[PDB]
Amino acid sequence: PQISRQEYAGLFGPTTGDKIRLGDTNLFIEIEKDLRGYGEESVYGGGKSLRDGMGANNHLTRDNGVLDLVITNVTIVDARLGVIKADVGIRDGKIAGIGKSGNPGVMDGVTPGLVVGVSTDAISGEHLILTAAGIDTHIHLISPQQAYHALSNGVATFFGGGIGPTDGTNGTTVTPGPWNIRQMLRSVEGLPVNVGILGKGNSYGRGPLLEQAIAGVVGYKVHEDWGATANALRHSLRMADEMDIQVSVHTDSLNECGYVEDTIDAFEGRTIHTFHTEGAGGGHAPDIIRVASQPNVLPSSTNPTLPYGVNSQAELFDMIMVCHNLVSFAESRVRPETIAAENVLHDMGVISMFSSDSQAMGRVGENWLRVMQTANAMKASRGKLPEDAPGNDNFRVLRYVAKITINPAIAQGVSHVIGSVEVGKMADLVLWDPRFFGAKPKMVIKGGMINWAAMGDPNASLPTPQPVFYRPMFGAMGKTMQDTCVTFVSQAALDDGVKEKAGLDRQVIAVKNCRTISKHDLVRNDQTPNIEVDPETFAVKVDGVHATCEPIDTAAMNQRYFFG
Amino acid sequence: PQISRQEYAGLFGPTTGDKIRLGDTNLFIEIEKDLRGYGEESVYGGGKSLRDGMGANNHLTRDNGVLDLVITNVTIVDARLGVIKADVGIRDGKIAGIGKSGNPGVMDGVTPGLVVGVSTDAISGEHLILTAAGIDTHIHLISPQQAYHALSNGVATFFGGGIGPTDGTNGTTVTPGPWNIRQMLRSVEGLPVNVGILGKGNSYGRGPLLEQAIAGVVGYKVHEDWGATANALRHSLRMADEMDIQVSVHTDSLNECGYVEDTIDAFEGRTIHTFHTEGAGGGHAPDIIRVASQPNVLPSSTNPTLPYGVNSQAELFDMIMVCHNLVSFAESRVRPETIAAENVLHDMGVISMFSSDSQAMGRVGENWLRVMQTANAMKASRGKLPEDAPGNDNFRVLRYVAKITINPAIAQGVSHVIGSVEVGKMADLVLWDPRFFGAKPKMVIKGGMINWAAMGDPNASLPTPQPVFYRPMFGAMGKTMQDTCVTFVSQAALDDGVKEKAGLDRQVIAVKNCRTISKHDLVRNDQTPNIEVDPETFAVKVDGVHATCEPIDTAAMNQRYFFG
Amino acid sequence: SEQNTPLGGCILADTPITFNENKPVTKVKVRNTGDRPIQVGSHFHFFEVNRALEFDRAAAYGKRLNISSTTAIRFEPGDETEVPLIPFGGKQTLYGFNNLVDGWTGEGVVPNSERPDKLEAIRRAAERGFKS
Amino acid sequence: SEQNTPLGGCILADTPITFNENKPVTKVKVRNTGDRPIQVGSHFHFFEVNRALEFDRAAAYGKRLNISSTTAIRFEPGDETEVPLIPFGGKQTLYGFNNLVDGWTGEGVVPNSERPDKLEAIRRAAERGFKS
Amino acid sequence: MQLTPREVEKLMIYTLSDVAFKRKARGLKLNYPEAVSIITVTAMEGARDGKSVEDVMKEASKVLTKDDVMDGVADLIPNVQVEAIFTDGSRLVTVHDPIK
Amino acid sequence: MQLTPREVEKLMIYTLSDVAFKRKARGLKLNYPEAVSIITVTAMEGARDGKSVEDVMKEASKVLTKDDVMDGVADLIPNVQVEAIFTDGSRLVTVHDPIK
Ligand code: NI
Ligand code: NI
Ligand code: NI
Ligand code: NI
């Protein structure tokens, strides 16, 4: 038979050629591909297709590869797969398939591995967007409660450091030394997010670095506050290459031991992650932004400058002046010209990642929000990216998504296990209502279980009655919370028995592929142009073109959606 | 700079748009894609690019993901990847990557995972074709020496049965009972091919089937010789579905308990592998070929009828009359009309696999030879397949390749580990000279080591001096031969500790995904047309069209190449 | 357009969706002979529907309703409706429902005869009380 | 054509191959001042070639010969040849050879100055005996 | 007072609606949370006042207009549901398309 | 309403400031918590009202005097900080020496 699109959509959601508005933004995504045929559509319910002997197989044991979970008729927004409509399948807390789910007994075209059976539960994705969960590379471990704010914006992995609210943690992403590391590994067992910890890089010999490596860190953080010296850099990077771990940097803002060019030379063409690349959050003043030209630099921005708004200068000024309990350090630190420039460079694919800088100038619960907010402000000011397709904003959206998903993963050497909706990966997933995209998710799926969700009255006759607020779920409960969460570590540590030694019940996974990567390995954000900054007026030129845009008055996904 | 194609080719072999003649055939393959850029071409030698600190990395330890082996500048002919030019990389006896190999320090565009280093050895693929190793699903375990004949035509996996030259083995692919199975598992430890063993299916209750399942079989073989009854079928298939193992069949030639239609009904829409689907090798006379219409049937032909030649009728006649120590059984068994039909159906994608029937009417060392011989006879008679591209024979070639590679694997539930040149798979690979394609390989790579090769005088000053003949290599030696070879088993067996119990040093891998598959899951050979056979004249109609072709006088890759 | 779409809204293309196009269609006449409403879904094995439904049961062997996945047809007491039927796909292996088949429902290979397991099924329906 | 190709032969297209197109080219003049032949390959760090070769060594810093991968240039005794030079790609990290650099050979970020590690390298060449 | 989890949870509603009612009275156009609050409490208070489910439903579907909300909020609130304590017990109230 | 941890937390502020504003209107001199509440909500409400960070800052630095607080409270409140949701997003507001 023949059915109208409108009727089809109502049953099954949007198909190839259909367009979806991402909130109250002016971004419109379009479905590129529909992997789940027509006429044999898998839906859970009374009188529906995923019933016994019909869409569901009723004779196969689980060891035949029957699924543990299926997400049906869902729109996948992923930086590597693009914008597709598919069934998604989970087995052993891993993504087994993307395609057409059902029962091959009674159905043509069931994707191998997507057999629904006796073992299978179901999620109805018809009117939903599925993303990879975000990854926040710049976490200060000041407060355990950050995790909750994060899960509530669709972030489920933390990279950083600290030891609670010490003055060192308030300023840097460091967990210093083997005692403190051990302690912190043990603590995070109580958190419903994945974690990897960073160590203190400012050391003269190998000894003090190696120490922390074996103790379990995934990285070394080089910070001004503890000394952002050439020495620090050099030894940190040399060790890193030895240990297959990452190095992150917060450069010398004062220009004490050098200018940016000297820092660059301290990198010695070695892979490095550069936090708040613009400089409002720290770095060689006015011109740390020039590191975004280099192939060995994996650049990030912290989220308080994105998007650039009318209140942005006022805020930042006042913030530093309290951050550093303080004026010529101030107005040199806080530069309208470079902030605008950061925005543009993002849109170009020259700054490759978003981050929070949690409770050290940024907002742990706003990375997915701000990303979307930025994409939309930038469409307005610049129009369509050249690579956009005329009818849709896919190219753009997808650039931005890479920023909080696959790119962070790649940077910290965990793209083998997390960061994209792809076969063989850990199911660290987020479900969104389009109406709420970026802002307010439906749920978080954390190791194949729902860990976090928007839930109303537990006494009510439905799950939807008011008050609806974010709450832990069963994956967040008991021994499952550890079972479903990863503690990232060094291979050195893994090999030394960190899991036993530290007594960790978390999944313990070795970071890998941190040192052979470059800017060009980054997804949709692989551009290395010439960047020039004017030491007087702080004006930024990118391949000779002035890089600016005007501040926004009104943000999307903002006062409409939030009481906060 | 600018270089001529001809000069380029001489250095690096063929690139995108270049065409290669497969032997003395009229088949021409064309390179679809070139994955390994231009100007940074990785080659082993004195004064070349894969030297220390240049194309090769000299500072990374192996745990950074440096390769164990690299095959450079090679033309990949694979049923899932197609016809591409790439670097191929091996790590931990597995395919880590297909792309551009080198040193990211000094080179742009190195595929992740394809870092060449201190750990890396090299193979020069410039003037070579790389295939997946073939898989022979119909092996009679009559003679251990078959393995050598197989390796020498590019086959490295055996599925079948037997117990040496017993009358039961001479006729069927059965290893009957738990004692015999154990024995045979233990024996094959001495063979340089992968193996999975088949059991005897002709049983009334579950007991006798389950027995063999736990003992380690991957399948049950239902044969006339031991009874090809409805009972047999039914119980075999029911068990199979329980055990996630396969069932293969050799049907009742005499029509004793039934006609083909009754056999079909005994299958009870359950997945099944049908040997010698044409019938010259056994089966319901004249019309077993009609099983190739059914979605649950995974059809195979044995190799003595392919290609159809002028001596084919004479041979086969006389063969049965000795096979069965014997005339109205004979001329009903041996039908020119259905033999021609088999040839056509192959070319259509209706018969999905080639097989040998080793020393029980077919030729263990001729599967790759005959496949190519068939493709070429068929091009001649039929012309271009409709889906062929005008300038090339890729569509065709690739259909045929699927027949000895990925399709067998899928049928026996081992496509997860073997059968295609794809990332994450066991490196079970064959290297060929185009000049010799299908006939005479260069080498076999068996679990990441070279196990078998064409080697001349071991006393000589080179490897090439005469006499050149096939010889075992180091992968075929010592404890490595077991380390690099797989013994396929049932999950039941695996779970019961077959490896310990039987004392096997081989890799022991559980078969999986045998029962949810259908004809449509097969690669390039997924067609289910209407097939009709005339009970008088044995004429075959396929969707109403007479299915015939004329016999060949002269085979390609034949008397030019072989003394045999 | 884009200027008019609500928050999270969809802009749908025009082209209708065509489903089940290849599949051969059998029309059967269905009367509900019970006192209570009967409703049947898209993927149910029509052959095995509520005993109280009276239709040509033989014709529904291996069949489902040729309607949209997930939807249903309602048969109110004492009413007659014509319904389109189509065969199941895949392997045509039907386990469970009312335990009438618990197997293969395909045609097999012989045009202008019935498979005996079909005739068995049909006989068994009759004496389990499934109205034809 | 196809009718004319030998067994295993190739039918090559016409279009020439273009390599290293983006990369900036430095021409240097090279004299072999030794008594023995010197031959240098495509991926060798030209800066670090045989002491007996006399050329503008500073100009070869971070450079390779702009020739076909795997090929080489032969410098016979007492002969002079001009050679095209191009920078290395990737990370521009050069370890080993004659232990002149054992690092980063990039330009860095300041147009119309030299990085000091480059000047170090160049000085070190001079007093290890590498002729300029 | 022996407050149960259900009782305590309902304090959130009361607090957000008080803020919301103050804002609406300043002429502010309401957002999503705020609007949902006002509809929810209207129902709840009706229940307490002794009305029927039917009657409260009407009442709550009429408290807010398109004008009173920020553009688009309607699209965000297709229905509101709350359990309230009626004379005959706890009952679910669905309020259909409350922003007309 | 899909309340996030940040949203829920802010209800505490609203509840304490309502109490605080009632007390100030009785002529009670405010304590530390109470005073911090009133300054905080003033900012927050400004944000919502559509003002600039600059403008709310002024407003909040002027709501309470020395007279309105208990002796010494000033010494306890050198600055107040809150994140509010401005038209352009969430922003930090520092209010310098609010009790003058
Ligand atoms: Ni920082
Ligand atoms: Ni920080
Ligand atoms: Ni046979
Ligand atoms: Ni046989």
mmCIF file of N, CA and C in Angstrom, chain B residues 321-396:
data_model
loop_
_atom_site.group_PDB
_atom_site.id
_atom_site.type_symbol
_atom_site.label_atom_id
_atom_site.label_comp_id
_atom_site.label_asym_id
_atom_site.label_seq_id
_atom_site.Cartn_x
_atom_site.Cartn_y
_atom_site.Cartn_z
ATOM 1 N N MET B 321 30.210 -44.670 -11.936
ATOM 2 C CA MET B 321 30.223 -46.068 -12.177
ATOM 3 C C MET B 321 31.358 -46.754 -11.538
ATOM 4 N N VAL B 322 32.369 -46.028 -11.091
ATOM 5 C CA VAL B 322 33.325 -46.601 -10.202
ATOM 6 C C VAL B 322 33.152 -46.158 -8.785
ATOM 7 N N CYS B 323 32.729 -44.921 -8.567
ATOM 8 C CA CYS B 323 32.486 -44.448 -7.220
ATOM 9 C C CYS B 323 31.568 -45.423 -6.489
ATOM 10 N N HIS B 324 30.507 -45.875 -7.168
ATOM 11 C CA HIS B 324 29.513 -46.789 -6.634
ATOM 12 C C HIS B 324 29.695 -48.215 -7.136
ATOM 13 N N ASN B 325 30.911 -48.585 -7.489
ATOM 14 C CA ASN B 325 31.195 -49.891 -8.073
ATOM 15 C C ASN B 325 30.093 -50.528 -8.923
ATOM 16 N N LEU B 326 29.609 -49.812 -9.914
ATOM 17 C CA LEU B 326 28.557 -50.358 -10.673
ATOM 18 C C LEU B 326 29.114 -51.261 -11.747
ATOM 19 N N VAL B 327 22.744 -48.571 -14.853
ATOM 20 C CA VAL B 327 22.984 -47.555 -15.856
ATOM 21 C C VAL B 327 21.904 -46.557 -15.976
ATOM 22 N N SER B 328 20.870 -46.779 -15.219
ATOM 23 C CA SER B 328 19.733 -45.930 -15.214
ATOM 24 C C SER B 328 19.741 -45.111 -13.963
ATOM 25 N N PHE B 329 20.538 -45.529 -12.989
ATOM 26 C CA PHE B 329 21.009 -44.659 -11.948
ATOM 27 C C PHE B 329 22.049 -43.706 -12.512
ATOM 28 N N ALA B 330 22.839 -44.162 -13.498
ATOM 29 C CA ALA B 330 23.976 -43.394 -14.010
ATOM 30 C C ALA B 330 23.549 -42.194 -14.836
ATOM 31 N N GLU B 331 22.797 -42.416 -15.885
ATOM 32 C CA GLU B 331 22.356 -41.402 -16.850
ATOM 33 C C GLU B 331 21.261 -40.507 -16.308
ATOM 34 N N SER B 332 20.815 -40.783 -15.117
ATOM 35 C CA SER B 332 19.904 -39.959 -14.362
ATOM 36 C C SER B 332 20.597 -39.090 -13.338
ATOM 37 N N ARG B 333 21.799 -39.486 -12.987
ATOM 38 C CA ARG B 333 22.702 -38.859 -12.071
ATOM 39 C C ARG B 333 23.532 -37.826 -12.788
ATOM 40 N N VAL B 334 23.812 -38.047 -14.052
ATOM 41 C CA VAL B 334 24.755 -37.329 -14.819
ATOM 42 C C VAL B 334 24.017 -36.753 -16.022
ATOM 43 N N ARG B 335 23.682 -35.505 -15.889
ATOM 44 C CA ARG B 335 22.785 -34.731 -16.716
ATOM 45 C C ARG B 335 23.429 -33.488 -17.310
ATOM 46 N N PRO B 336 23.755 -33.496 -18.592
ATOM 47 C CA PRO B 336 24.352 -32.308 -19.224
ATOM 48 C C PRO B 336 23.595 -31.024 -18.997
ATOM 49 N N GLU B 337 22.278 -31.146 -18.985
ATOM 50 C CA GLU B 337 21.354 -30.031 -18.826
ATOM 51 C C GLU B 337 21.436 -29.352 -17.482
ATOM 52 N N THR B 338 21.569 -30.095 -16.430
ATOM 53 C CA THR B 338 21.617 -29.482 -15.140
ATOM 54 C C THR B 338 23.044 -28.951 -14.811
ATOM 55 N N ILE B 339 24.060 -29.536 -15.428
ATOM 56 C CA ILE B 339 25.444 -29.164 -15.248
ATOM 57 C C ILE B 339 25.677 -27.782 -15.840
ATOM 58 N N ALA B 340 25.252 -27.567 -17.069
ATOM 59 C CA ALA B 340 25.164 -26.269 -17.686
ATOM 60 C C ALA B 340 24.384 -25.281 -16.873
ATOM 61 N N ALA B 341 23.308 -25.724 -16.328
ATOM 62 C CA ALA B 341 22.472 -24.895 -15.534
ATOM 63 C C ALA B 341 23.201 -24.398 -14.298
ATOM 64 N N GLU B 342 23.992 -25.257 -13.679
ATOM 65 C CA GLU B 342 24.773 -24.947 -12.469
ATOM 66 C C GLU B 342 25.708 -23.737 -12.745
ATOM 67 N N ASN B 343 26.384 -23.736 -13.843
ATOM 68 C CA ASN B 343 27.284 -22.765 -14.421
ATOM 69 C C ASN B 343 26.611 -21.408 -14.553
ATOM 70 N N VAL B 344 25.428 -21.406 -15.082
ATOM 71 C CA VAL B 344 24.645 -20.212 -15.259
ATOM 72 C C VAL B 344 24.181 -19.647 -13.963
ATOM 73 N N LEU B 345 23.730 -20.468 -13.099
ATOM 74 C CA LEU B 345 23.213 -20.044 -11.848
ATOM 75 C C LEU B 345 24.275 -19.402 -10.933
ATOM 76 N N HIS B 346 25.469 -19.909 -11.042
ATOM 77 C CA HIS B 346 26.677 -19.356 -10.466
ATOM 78 C C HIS B 346 26.867 -17.936 -10.893
ATOM 79 N N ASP B 347 26.924 -17.712 -12.185
ATOM 80 C CA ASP B 347 27.035 -16.424 -12.806
ATOM 81 C C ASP B 347 25.938 -15.458 -12.469
ATOM 82 N N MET B 348 24.796 -15.928 -12.133
ATOM 83 C CA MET B 348 23.647 -15.145 -11.695
ATOM 84 C C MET B 348 23.664 -14.747 -10.237
ATOM 85 N N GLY B 349 24.450 -15.360 -9.432
ATOM 86 C CA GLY B 349 24.390 -15.259 -8.019
ATOM 87 C C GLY B 349 23.337 -16.083 -7.296
ATOM 88 N N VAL B 350 22.909 -17.166 -7.882
ATOM 89 C CA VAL B 350 21.927 -18.081 -7.348
ATOM 90 C C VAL B 350 22.542 -19.277 -6.589
ATOM 91 N N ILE B 351 23.682 -19.796 -6.963
ATOM 92 C CA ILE B 351 24.516 -20.730 -6.179
ATOM 93 C C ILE B 351 25.690 -19.933 -5.560
ATOM 94 N N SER B 352 25.803 -19.980 -4.284
ATOM 95 C CA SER B 352 26.515 -19.015 -3.523
ATOM 96 C C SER B 352 27.980 -19.362 -3.129
ATOM 97 N N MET B 353 28.402 -20.575 -3.264
ATOM 98 C CA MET B 353 29.657 -21.216 -2.900
ATOM 99 C C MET B 353 30.150 -22.376 -3.722
ATOM 100 N N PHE B 354 31.444 -22.371 -3.912
ATOM 101 C CA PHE B 354 32.268 -23.373 -4.423
ATOM 102 C C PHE B 354 32.833 -24.188 -3.246
ATOM 103 N N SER B 355 33.164 -25.418 -3.503
ATOM 104 C CA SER B 355 33.642 -26.484 -2.624
ATOM 105 C C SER B 355 34.237 -27.605 -3.413
ATOM 106 N N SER B 356 34.959 -28.488 -2.573
ATOM 107 C CA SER B 356 35.730 -29.509 -3.257
ATOM 108 C C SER B 356 35.081 -30.862 -3.121
ATOM 109 N N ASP B 357 34.692 -31.316 -2.176
ATOM 110 C CA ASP B 357 34.285 -32.710 -2.083
ATOM 111 C C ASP B 357 35.524 -33.648 -2.126
ATOM 112 N N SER B 358 36.610 -33.226 -1.493
ATOM 113 C CA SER B 358 37.978 -33.743 -1.620
ATOM 114 C C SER B 358 38.044 -35.239 -1.616
ATOM 115 N N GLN B 359 38.555 -35.802 -2.687
ATOM 116 C CA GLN B 359 38.770 -37.236 -2.924
ATOM 117 C C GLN B 359 37.540 -38.108 -2.741
ATOM 118 N N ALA B 360 36.419 -37.464 -2.919
ATOM 119 C CA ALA B 360 35.046 -37.897 -3.067
ATOM 120 C C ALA B 360 34.282 -37.065 -4.130
ATOM 121 N N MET B 361 34.810 -37.077 -5.284
ATOM 122 C CA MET B 361 34.551 -36.529 -6.590
ATOM 123 C C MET B 361 35.101 -35.139 -6.979
ATOM 124 N N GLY B 362 35.604 -34.385 -6.033
ATOM 125 C CA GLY B 362 36.235 -33.101 -6.376
ATOM 126 C C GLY B 362 37.705 -32.974 -5.982
ATOM 127 N N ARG B 363 38.297 -31.766 -6.119
ATOM 128 C CA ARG B 363 39.735 -31.429 -6.251
ATOM 129 C C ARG B 363 40.064 -30.209 -5.349
ATOM 130 N N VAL B 364 40.526 -30.521 -4.165
ATOM 131 C CA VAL B 364 40.983 -29.756 -3.061
ATOM 132 C C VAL B 364 41.966 -28.704 -3.401
ATOM 133 N N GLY B 365 42.705 -28.880 -4.417
ATOM 134 C CA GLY B 365 43.693 -27.929 -4.904
ATOM 135 C C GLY B 365 43.403 -27.124 -6.151
ATOM 136 N N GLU B 366 42.156 -26.980 -6.446
ATOM 137 C CA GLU B 366 41.604 -26.394 -7.640
ATOM 138 C C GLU B 366 40.384 -25.434 -7.467
ATOM 139 N N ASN B 367 39.970 -25.106 -6.292
ATOM 140 C CA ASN B 367 38.862 -24.191 -5.953
ATOM 141 C C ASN B 367 39.094 -22.751 -6.416
ATOM 142 N N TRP B 368 40.279 -22.205 -6.178
ATOM 143 C CA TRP B 368 40.638 -20.865 -6.647
ATOM 144 C C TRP B 368 40.829 -20.919 -8.149
ATOM 145 N N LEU B 369 41.450 -21.970 -8.684
ATOM 146 C CA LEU B 369 41.632 -22.192 -10.128
ATOM 147 C C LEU B 369 40.296 -22.277 -10.859
ATOM 148 N N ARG B 370 39.303 -22.929 -10.273
ATOM 149 C CA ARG B 370 38.171 -23.307 -11.070
ATOM 150 C C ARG B 370 37.153 -22.147 -11.170
ATOM 151 N N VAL B 371 37.015 -21.439 -10.095
ATOM 152 C CA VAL B 371 36.345 -20.173 -9.849
ATOM 153 C C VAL B 371 36.677 -19.148 -10.932
ATOM 154 N N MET B 372 37.926 -18.904 -11.124
ATOM 155 C CA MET B 372 38.492 -18.072 -12.173
ATOM 156 C C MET B 372 38.253 -18.643 -13.548
ATOM 157 N N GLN B 373 38.411 -19.878 -13.680
ATOM 158 C CA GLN B 373 38.135 -20.592 -14.934
ATOM 159 C C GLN B 373 36.640 -20.455 -15.382
ATOM 160 N N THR B 374 35.738 -20.518 -14.448
ATOM 161 C CA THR B 374 34.298 -20.390 -14.590
ATOM 162 C C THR B 374 33.888 -18.964 -14.968
ATOM 163 N N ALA B 375 34.312 -17.944 -14.215
ATOM 164 C CA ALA B 375 34.134 -16.540 -14.489
ATOM 165 C C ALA B 375 34.489 -16.178 -15.898
ATOM 166 N N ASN B 376 35.568 -16.667 -16.382
ATOM 167 C CA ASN B 376 36.109 -16.456 -17.700
ATOM 168 C C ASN B 376 35.397 -17.210 -18.781
ATOM 169 N N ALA B 377 34.974 -18.429 -18.554
ATOM 170 C CA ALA B 377 34.169 -19.140 -19.534
ATOM 171 C C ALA B 377 32.811 -18.458 -19.716
ATOM 172 N N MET B 378 32.253 -18.019 -18.651
ATOM 173 C CA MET B 378 30.973 -17.357 -18.566
ATOM 174 C C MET B 378 30.941 -15.954 -19.178
ATOM 175 N N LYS B 379 32.008 -15.171 -19.042
ATOM 176 C CA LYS B 379 32.148 -13.891 -19.718
ATOM 177 C C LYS B 379 32.083 -14.086 -21.206
ATOM 178 N N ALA B 380 32.798 -15.037 -21.664
ATOM 179 C CA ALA B 380 32.820 -15.427 -23.044
ATOM 180 C C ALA B 380 31.416 -15.745 -23.581
ATOM 181 N N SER B 381 30.680 -16.596 -22.901
ATOM 182 C CA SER B 381 29.370 -17.072 -23.346
ATOM 183 C C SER B 381 28.218 -16.112 -23.178
ATOM 184 N N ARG B 382 28.215 -15.334 -22.159
ATOM 185 C CA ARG B 382 27.138 -14.494 -21.717
ATOM 186 C C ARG B 382 27.390 -13.017 -21.866
ATOM 187 N N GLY B 383 28.628 -12.601 -21.982
ATOM 188 C CA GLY B 383 29.101 -11.278 -21.818
ATOM 189 C C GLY B 383 29.060 -10.696 -20.450
ATOM 190 N N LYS B 384 28.961 -9.387 -20.414
ATOM 191 C CA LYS B 384 28.995 -8.644 -19.197
ATOM 192 C C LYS B 384 27.728 -8.818 -18.465
ATOM 193 N N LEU B 385 27.871 -9.187 -17.269
ATOM 194 C CA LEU B 385 26.827 -9.038 -16.340
ATOM 195 C C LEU B 385 26.238 -7.650 -16.401
ATOM 196 N N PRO B 386 24.959 -7.540 -16.124
ATOM 197 C CA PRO B 386 24.275 -6.256 -16.289
ATOM 198 C C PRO B 386 24.768 -5.187 -15.384
ATOM 199 N N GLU B 387 25.075 -5.555 -14.159
ATOM 200 C CA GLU B 387 25.723 -4.742 -13.154
ATOM 201 C C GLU B 387 27.207 -4.481 -13.373
ATOM 202 N N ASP B 388 27.879 -5.141 -14.288
ATOM 203 C CA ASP B 388 29.213 -4.738 -14.614
ATOM 204 C C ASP B 388 29.219 -3.308 -15.137
ATOM 205 N N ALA B 389 30.209 -2.717 -14.892
ATOM 206 C CA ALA B 389 30.727 -1.485 -15.453
ATOM 207 C C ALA B 389 31.371 -1.740 -16.792
ATOM 208 N N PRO B 390 31.209 -0.839 -17.724
ATOM 209 C CA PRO B 390 31.658 -1.123 -19.076
ATOM 210 C C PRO B 390 33.110 -1.370 -19.265
ATOM 211 N N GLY B 391 33.962 -0.680 -18.559
ATOM 212 C CA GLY B 391 35.336 -0.907 -18.822
ATOM 213 C C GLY B 391 35.965 -2.084 -18.113
ATOM 214 N N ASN B 392 35.324 -2.603 -17.084
ATOM 215 C CA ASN B 392 35.863 -3.643 -16.219
ATOM 216 C C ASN B 392 34.905 -4.745 -15.749
ATOM 217 N N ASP B 393 35.543 -5.809 -15.298
ATOM 218 C CA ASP B 393 35.023 -7.046 -14.807
ATOM 219 C C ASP B 393 34.990 -7.211 -13.303
ATOM 220 N N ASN B 394 35.050 -6.145 -12.569
ATOM 221 C CA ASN B 394 35.012 -6.121 -11.127
ATOM 222 C C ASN B 394 33.779 -6.789 -10.527
ATOM 223 N N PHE B 395 32.586 -6.404 -10.924
ATOM 224 C CA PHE B 395 31.351 -6.974 -10.440
ATOM 225 C C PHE B 395 31.392 -8.489 -10.505
ATOM 226 N N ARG B 396 31.766 -9.009 -11.638
ATOM 227 C CA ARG B 396 31.873 -10.398 -11.887
ATOM 228 C C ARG B 396 32.878 -11.094 -10.974
#
